[PDB]
Write a protein that holds these residues in place. Structure first.
Motif, PDB file in Angstrom:
ATOM      1  N   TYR A  12       0.825  -1.204   0.000  1.00  0.00           N
ATOM      2  CA  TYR A  12       0.000   0.000   0.000  1.00  0.00           C
ATOM      3  C   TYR A  12       0.861   1.256   0.000  1.00  0.00           C
ATOM      4  CZ  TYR A  12      -4.852  -1.483   0.260  1.00  0.00           C
ATOM      5  OH  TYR A  12      -6.107  -1.954  -0.044  1.00  0.00           O
ATOM      6  N   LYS A  17      -1.142   4.783  -1.264  1.00  0.00           N
ATOM      7  CA  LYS A  17      -2.528   4.848  -0.827  1.00  0.00           C
ATOM      8  C   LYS A  17      -2.677   4.446   0.634  1.00  0.00           C
ATOM      9  CE  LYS A  17      -5.796   3.333  -3.521  1.00  0.00           C
ATOM     10  NZ  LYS A  17      -6.581   2.417  -4.397  1.00  0.00           N
ATOM     11  N   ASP A  20      -7.457   0.198   2.506  1.00  0.00           N
ATOM     12  CA  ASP A  20      -8.830   0.027   2.064  1.00  0.00           C
ATOM     13  C   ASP A  20      -9.548  -0.989   2.948  1.00  0.00           C
ATOM     14  OD1 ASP A  20      -7.965   1.703   0.032  1.00  0.00           O
ATOM     15  OD2 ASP A  20      -7.611   0.042  -1.361  1.00  0.00           O
ATOM     16  N   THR A  21     -10.851  -1.147   2.707  1.00  0.00           N
ATOM     17  CA  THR A  21     -11.625  -2.137   3.450  1.00  0.00           C
ATOM     18  C   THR A  21     -11.118  -3.548   3.177  1.00  0.00           C
ATOM     19  OG1 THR A  21     -13.571  -0.699   3.418  1.00  0.00           O
ATOM     20  CG2 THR A  21     -13.929  -3.036   3.864  1.00  0.00           C
ATOM     21  N   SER A  22     -10.752  -3.833   1.924  1.00  0.00           N
ATOM     22  CA  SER A  22     -10.186  -5.138   1.596  1.00  0.00           C
ATOM     23  C   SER A  22      -8.889  -5.380   2.357  1.00  0.00           C
ATOM     24  CB  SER A  22      -9.951  -5.239   0.090  1.00  0.00           C
ATOM     25  OG  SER A  22      -8.879  -4.407  -0.314  1.00  0.00           O
TER      26      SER A  22
ATOM     27  N   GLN C  40      -8.757   2.455  11.116  1.00  0.00           N
ATOM     28  CA  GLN C  40      -9.898   2.801  10.276  1.00  0.00           C
ATOM     29  C   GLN C  40     -10.439   4.182  10.621  1.00  0.00           C
ATOM     30  OE1 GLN C  40     -11.778   2.970   7.391  1.00  0.00           O
ATOM     31  NE2 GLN C  40     -11.624   0.735   7.528  1.00  0.00           N
ATOM     32  N   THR C  43      -8.030   6.761   9.276  1.00  0.00           N
ATOM     33  CA  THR C  43      -8.048   6.840   7.821  1.00  0.00           C
ATOM     34  C   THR C  43      -9.304   7.532   7.312  1.00  0.00           C
ATOM     35  OG1 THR C  43      -6.778   4.782   7.769  1.00  0.00           O
ATOM     36  CG2 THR C  43      -7.810   5.497   5.719  1.00  0.00           C
ATOM     37  N   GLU C  44     -10.453   7.249   7.930  1.00  0.00           N
ATOM     38  CA  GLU C  44     -11.714   7.800   7.441  1.00  0.00           C
ATOM     39  C   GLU C  44     -11.733   9.322   7.535  1.00  0.00           C
ATOM     40  OE1 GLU C  44     -14.569   3.927   8.172  1.00  0.00           O
ATOM     41  OE2 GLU C  44     -14.083   5.329   9.789  1.00  0.00           O
TER      42      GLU C  44
END
Ligand code: CYC
Ligand code: CYC
Ligand code: CYC
Ligand code: CYC
Ligand code: CYC
Ligand code: CYC
Ligand code: CYC
Lengths: 162, 98, 160, 160, 162, 162, 160, 162, 160, 162, 162
Positions: A12, A17, A20-22, C40, C43-44
């Motif tokens: 990544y 980037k 991600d969710t994946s 998460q 990041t969001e």
């Protein structure tokens, strides 16, 4: 020398980037398998002496000519070298199983080993057979769920030597 | 002067005297190394309670003054280099000290 | 990561993972879910954190965007905010890894002489990362906030 | 110890402790109560564990107490059981410490040389510590039995 | 070096004794303070530069002769060496506080320090003053109990040099 | 080092004289004793492990304190260090017997050893008792003449540690 | 000597002497009587060997005693003969030792620097050593001459 | 020889500073514990002979080989010297407890003691066992708090010897 | 201190502390609080005492500051008042200790040779200490001044 | 001890020869320098306390840490010890100067002084500075010719400590 | 190390003031001799081997016993070590002459010289004589003006040994 966490971090970071969710799901999978990985590594550290015992015995049973004079292992020196090779291979397979990635095999095991054996003339077939002998046994001690995990790393070592 | 304070003013005056004194010492020794080394970390010491721009202006002023008295091109360029080391070290420590 | 460091330490002595090392890896994999939650959440809300991080950085140090400063100009300020984005992404990577080794390998080793080539003031970097820490720890709960702020304090100490 | 290990790891590269090191110390001090409970149980039951482990060892390998054996005689059997007491004490030490460092520094460095100077068979010691692991993990609950078994199993591998 | 756990382990190992009730009391007491110690260590790691700067300011204000000509802080080189020694002392006080024992302070810092400073010409009394300045700075940032704990180790360093 | 032949060569080199009758008598004495010395050296080399075992058992039976908690030889490491010291004492006594001179015992064993044991806290009286036990065990295996000869060097080591 | 070489070779490896080494000392001490006879023969004939070696050297190399020569003069010629006497004594020492170790320690280490500081030609030394080789090996029997000739050869090679 | 008060006086003298609040706090703590110290010291002084008798009995019961022929405590003079040493350890632990500092133990007891015993052949581990015997005997007479206080000095002696 | 002195006296006779030393220690620790208050009184107003005592000393012995005197000049007068500060601090140390041991150890042993090297007149030191005693007894209230005077008395007897 | 005349006597005694021209030349050199030596010795004896005073004042002005709290010379006791050491150095340097040999400095002063200072904690650098201070103070008093003669002995003491 | 310039600069830097008249006088004196000293250093650098040859010849002619059996210079190895030491003394005297200071002699020669020569048994008086012989030879080779400057540092070495 990178684990699954560092593997996704690098894949990544190279593209620049964020996760991600994946990526989070792929992290979740490793975090879930971590406990069974640790248990398998503990059992392997427990029985490493025994797996070395049986692996040497079975390898020198199915192929007789190695221990006998004129064999690839015919010396106490070469015998100790072969058993040490099994010990290092198994320890590094356990390392790779804990890390969940095969990079450590490339960066500390296959790094210069293949052409070292080629120059030394070590039979690749006998080494590969030793690796099957090691993994078919270690799978029983570690359990089927950990057996399938150890299988990919032992097969990776075999294909690298092959 | 008034807002700067007496203690900081004493420090500033002794520091100008310091620069001139090591210029003299470097000229005698034949190497500006003492100035370079003692200036390769001075900026971060100075910044919080001092103005780096003011220091650079002061060192340029002493460079011009000392170049004035020499009346010889080689001497002028030599002393100018021995002051340019101060300016260059202060400018080089724009980021942290090495 | 924790697993990688444990494996390296065991390999240094040519031995298996110690009971303490197996335990530390077990603790790491046990709490990985909470680290995923933290990463998460960071990041969001990345764009906010970056924008007001630049806001407190520029208000606390107006000289940087003042004429003669390192960050003067639309392009140079954009590179400033992009560096902040890089470091926030590195912090999230460290949260996932459970340690600061991604920060080491990406953005810490050689950062001083790189920003020396860039004239970039390291006190400015420290103030920017402190603003990032304040904001990010603000969005997160205190139990999260402590461990999230430890990584940012690590980065600030590295830059300082 | 875990704390000592973290501190020396930090001191090796001349830095304050990283967030991962603080996290592992936090986990170690979070598990203090169960460590003390387990060590308290093992100390409470030292006589029972040593008795049962000696019985099982001598039944499994009668040749040790057979004439011509190393442990033959009341005094040599007493020394044999005294060694088991030593290693049980070391295991409790390593449990409170959080790692196998006290075990290694007291009863693993030079143990092979020592037992060769005593005509003490190493496989006999492996069997003895394995039997003592079995007996000890018999008393403790399921979760604690594994973590005690890690210490006993390290010691067994060290002797082997 | 050793922490409190290792100190108790050694004091029961030399006696050939298992842990009794007092030993478990000491171990429980140490485990009780672990979270406080980690919090204080993290805070001091976060604020080490601030503490060193303000303590050095206090020391050089109360000891003006150090930075004047003839003083053992009179150059940028010599001043930088002084502040590095200050960083040493703060780091090792943090280590000792986290361990809970002064063994690291005696082993890695205090042993041979007076002889080194005598060889160099460093003033030991001014170093003690700087350490006391460290203590004064650190107490406010760490809070009451952590200030007591960390002041124990600053006092140990001061008494070792004094 | 220096041996009997080298010792005579040195004492006739310092005075600048050629070999005379007395020097030839000393050289002939060493040459005659050489065969017995070689037999003794081979016997000790073959039985060094057993000699150390028996001498250590004797010493630790007479003084059980040394291997109980609080004793100098109380751990696996300190015990192994003790038996390593005994092994070195035996090997260097064999070297001195084979050389016929005690120079190697001075330069290579005893120069600095007693201060090392005072710093370490090793009981030198117990060490000398262990060396005497080694002498007693070695004499039985080597026979009367070689026992007298090796007892010379064992006593030299014991008195040097004094 | 041979014993010293064997013992230091074993000492530097932390091991007892091997059976081959013990055979070396056995064979060396077996030949002790012959070496003592050879040394006695050379020691009793020292004064004649010195004079014949000096005569052979000066007849082969008249330059050294020629005007402007190094040995020109009574005192310089006496010093030349005194050096020859030293090296004959060293050869006897090496014979009894069974190796060139006395020759190497007393006479070889630093000989070139010594004679350079004494403006003494090294080819003249080699010619003198060859002359003394001839004179000394003339006295001995064939087997003894072959043994002594090698010590003289080592001396000649060291001087060259 | 320095007590807690003298230690504070010295740490304030070396700095050249006058007394402030912290020093008064430390001296107030010492004055608070002084009553416990005095009561414990008086109890130990009144019962010193009983403590020595009990501890010597316990030690010679646990290690009977000491007072049997061939043991270091086998003669009237050696038994007397053994109980004399126990009297030293008890008396100096009482002094150190009353002073509140272990300086008298590094200062009058443990300096060169290992070398002295090693020269005499005195068993070190057995002496440490006797010091414990005194510790358990004294704790019962002095009560829980005074036992906790005297334990640090007895353990200091044990660790210094061990 | 009182405790240290009692311990030393007991050690000289190789006996435990008798009831006399024990209850004198109990009295000493009982009265420690008022000793602390007395020390605080002199510590808070130290500069007043030093300045008053210096004034009284120079009134009694103006020759000290006169040309040719040792206190002539501002710097030497400052050193004089600094010595008085030293002795005031030592007196407070003695008060908190309850004995003259700090005074004796820090400022009485070797004072003759030190002030002889500095050529300081010891009698002038005596009037300086007497002036300090007068001022301090002035500030203290009732019986407190009494014991303080004792310390000053000792110091005077120490210096004369 | 040994002086220049006794030095010549001793070398010719060990060589077992009567005096040659070289010996008489050495003796004549000593006789030439003797009157200057006597003048310098009388001068230093007259001004011993003075020389010590200015040398100590100069040293403590250059290194004010020594006399201030926490300095090695900070006490009446330690200051007097420093002055006593300096008086010894001056007197024995005068003895060596008047003798014409430095043997008395080796025996009486230098053989043991480094270890004494290292055990005491005295800064050897500051002590060499004090010796240099005495050297430059006494040079102005004895005169240039006598200053040259006294400087070698002060340098000898400084090098012996260093 | 130091030189004359560094010594002057440090003298006026520790005080904090510019160069006074005495500073300029010392600098002028040092600079005036600079070309003569460089010429001398070049002559010695090109001709060190000769100076060693005649100096050693003079020393061993004055003291033959050194190079005869029983003398400290009787061996090819010890003769070579002697002339090597002479080369050290010559080279370091040249370094000191060029530096204008004796700091390099204290730092890199005299530090550890007495211990070396006393451990090896080297005669210090004979070494002083050899240094004197190098003094006359060097003075004859480089001229009187440079002879005085080099003899200053040769005399420093000689007085450092004796
Ligand atoms: C950690 C990763 C790694 C390993 C394990 C490794 C093994 C390795 N095995 C070697 C020789 C050897 N290797 C073997 C083993 C082979 N011969 C047969 O027994 C088997 C078919 C096979 C076992 C897999 C033997 C017998 C020797 C010595 C024989 C010879 O001299 O050729 C050597 C040459 C140098 C030496 O032995 O000291 C290496 C480096 N190298 C590495 O970088
Ligand atoms: C020649 C080599 C050299 C120099 C110049 C030098 C300067 C120097 N000035 C200092 C203090 C100071 N210096 C200054 C400012 C002055 N500084 C100057 O460059 C300005 C002309 C001027 C103000 C415009 C101030 C205000 C302080 C007080 C402490 C602080 O800034 O925090 C300090 C820190 C020590 C102390 O606090 O006293 C140094 C090292 N050090 C060196 O080794
Ligand atoms: C992930 C690891 C990594 C980092 C951290 C990194 C930083 C970095 N920032 C750069 C530009 C820049 N970065 C900044 C920002 C700084 N200056 C301001 O004053 C602030 C104090 C501070 C930001 C808070 C600025 C102003 C520039 C423009 C400098 C120039 O173009 O010369 C550059 C030059 C190349 C480019 O812009 O594409 C680098 C390499 N690069 C990396 O590969
Ligand atoms: C705390 C670390 C530590 C350990 C572990 C330790 C072991 C130890 N075991 C010893 C004897 C012994 N040890 C054993 C035990 C063995 N016999 C059987 O083979 C079994 C396989 C096995 C026990 C399970 C026996 C029988 C002896 C008596 C041997 C003899 O005295 O001849 C001795 C020598 C005691 C003496 O001087 O008489 C030591 C030092 N010492 C230490 O300081
Ligand atoms: C035991 C080891 C050892 C040796 C070998 C040794 C040799 C030696 N030969 C010397 C002189 C001499 N050596 C010679 C011999 C030379 N003349 C011709 O050129 C020949 C090539 C050559 C002899 C074959 C001569 C002529 C001198 C006198 C030169 C002088 O006056 O310096 C000297 C100077 C002192 C003296 O004359 O006594 C030494 C030390 N010293 C030792 O300690
Ligand atoms: C803590 C115990 C202690 C004491 C007391 C002490 C005394 C002391 N007195 C000193 C000088 C001095 N002391 C005095 C005081 C004198 N002036 C008048 O004559 C009076 C008779 C008399 C005082 C009443 C003066 C004037 C000097 C300066 C002498 C000089 O500069 O040469 C100095 C030298 C200060 C330096 O070199 O920087 C010390 C160390 N030192 C210690 O460690
Ligand atoms: C630059 C600092 C320095 C010095 C000063 C120095 C001297 C020095 N000389 C040595 C040997 C020696 N030095 C001498 C000196 C001679 N003996 C004669 O009697 C003469 C009086 C005298 C010279 C004129 C001798 C004979 C030896 C051999 C001693 C031995 O090996 O036993 C050694 C022992 C190491 C070796 O043998 O090479 C040292 C260290 N080394 C250094 O690195």
């Amino acid at each position: 020398m990178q684990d699954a966490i560092t593997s996704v971090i690098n894949t990544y970071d190279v593209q620049g980037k964020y996760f991600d969710t994946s990526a989070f799901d792929k992290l979740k999978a490793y975090y879930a398998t971590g406990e069974l990985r640790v248990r398998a590594a503990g059992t392997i550290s427990a029985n490493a002496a025994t797996i070395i015992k049986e692996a040497s015995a079975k390898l020198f049973s199915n192929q007789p000519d190695l221990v006998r004079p004129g064999g690839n292992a015919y010396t106490t020196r070469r015998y100790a070298a072969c058993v040490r090779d099994m010990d290092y291979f198994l320890r590094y397979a356990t390392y790779a199983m804990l890390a969940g990635d095969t990079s450590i095999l490339d960066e500390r095991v296959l790094n210069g080993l293949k052409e070292t054996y080629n120059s030394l003339g070590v039979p690749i077939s006998s080494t590969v057979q030793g690796i099957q002998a090691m993994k078919e046994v270690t799978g029983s001690l570690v359990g089927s769920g950990a057996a399938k995990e150890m299988g990919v790393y032992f097969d990776y070592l075999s294909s690298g030597l092959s | 002067i008034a807002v700067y304070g007496p203690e900081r003013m004493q420090k500033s005056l002794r520091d100008l005297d310091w620069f001139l004194r090591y210029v003299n010492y470097s000229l005698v020794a034949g190497d500006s190394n003492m100035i370079l080394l003692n200036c390769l970390g001075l900026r971060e010491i100075l910044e919080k309670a001092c103005s780096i721009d003011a220091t650079i202006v002061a060192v340029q002023e002493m460079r011009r003054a000392a170049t004035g008295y020499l009346k010889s091109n080689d001497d002028k360029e030599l002393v100018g280099s021995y002051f340019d080391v101060i300016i260059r070290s202060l400018n080089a420590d724009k980021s942290d000290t090495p | 990561s924790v697993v990688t460091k444990a494996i390296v330490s065991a390999d240094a002595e040519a031995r298996y993972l110690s009971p303490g090392e197996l335990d530390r890896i077990r603790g790491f994999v046990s709490s990985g879910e909470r680290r995923l939650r933290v990463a998460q959440t960071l990041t969001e809300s990345r764009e906010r954190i970056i924008k007001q991080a630049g806001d407190q950085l520029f208000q606390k140090r107006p000289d940087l965007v003042s004429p003669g400063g390192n960050a003067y100009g639309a392009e140079r300020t954009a590179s400033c905010l992009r560096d902040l984005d890089y470091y926030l992404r590195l912090v999230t990577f460290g949260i996932v890894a459970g340690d600061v080794t991604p920060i080491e390998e990406i953005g810490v080793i050689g950062v001083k002489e790189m920003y020396r080539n860039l004239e970039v003031p390291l006190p400015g970097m420290v103030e920017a990362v402190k603003a990032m820490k304040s904001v990010a720890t603000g969005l997160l709960s205190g139990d999260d906030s402590a461990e999230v702020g430890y990584y940012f304090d690590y980065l600030a100490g590295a830059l300082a």
